[PDB]
Amino acid sequence: DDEEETYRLWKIRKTIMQLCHDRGYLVTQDGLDQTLEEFKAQFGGKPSEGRPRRTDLTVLVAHNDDPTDQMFVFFPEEPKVGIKTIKVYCQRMQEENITRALIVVQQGMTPSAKQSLVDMAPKYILEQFLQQELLINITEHELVPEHVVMTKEEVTELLARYKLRENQLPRIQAGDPVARYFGIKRGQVVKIIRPSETAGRYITYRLVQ
DNA sequence: GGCAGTACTAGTAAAGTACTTGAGCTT
């Protein structure tokens, strides 16, 4: 029902605000924590023939270092999406000059649309998110340790300390849901901090390939 | 004384996985 659908959209928006917060983009403390009834009073209850149409849930956010980069979050209204639709989205992207955006897909993507997401690396990068993947925050699960995406200088000092080539580190594939969660690209290194029952804390470094 | 036939001696035929493949559905 519209109560269930609205509750889903609340989960999704909140989880995407946690996404946006973990990537270092400016988020007010209210944007992270919205009680369901405050969200409903804002966006008006029922989606079906209702106030939220899945449009105006779109999100624009700015980076802490520079305001220019920003970001974007689309919510498509179609069950499945295609090259023409994404092409409209990238038209809005080039209209606003914002480089980075997301897409929350209700069901699936035609493979030509995925390939069309991989087509253009430099101009605009788009990341497919399924609707369910944002219905839960996996970083807050007990098994998933704290991840910290390392800057290039910290990576250089790291490889200087242990005298390591980049190939000799353990790896984490770019299709890993956590790597998606932080929006990580090939060649970056992630710093996992996990508690151990021998030392009490242990640091892993996973190269992204 | 010669020819034919027979015999003997010397070559000679549970489950579980990955992988692939065919079909079925879409730009």
Q: Spell out the domain ranges in chain A.
A: 1-136, 137-209
CB of residue A116 closer than 7 A to nucleic acid strand B? no
Q: A143 with A120: CB under 8 angstroms?
A: no
A81 nearest nucleotide via C1' and CA? B27
Contacts of A47 (CB under 8 A, 6+ apart): A2, A5, A6, A9, A53, A54
Task: Tell me the technique behind this structure.
Answer: cryo-EM
A113 nearest nucleotide via C1' and CA? B27
Q: How is domain A137-209 classified at the architecture level of CATH?
A: Alpha-Beta Complex (3.90)
Resolution given for this structure, in angstroms: 3.4
Angle A182-A167-A151 from CA coordinates, rounded to 5°: 40
CB of residue A82 closer than 7 A to nucleic acid strand B? yes
| A69 closest CA partner among A105, A103, A24 | A24
| A77 closest CA partner among A56, A95, A99 | A56
CB of residue A80 closer than 7 A to nucleic acid strand B? yes
Q: How is domain A1-136 classified at the architecture level of CATH?
A: 3-Layer(aba) Sandwich (3.40)
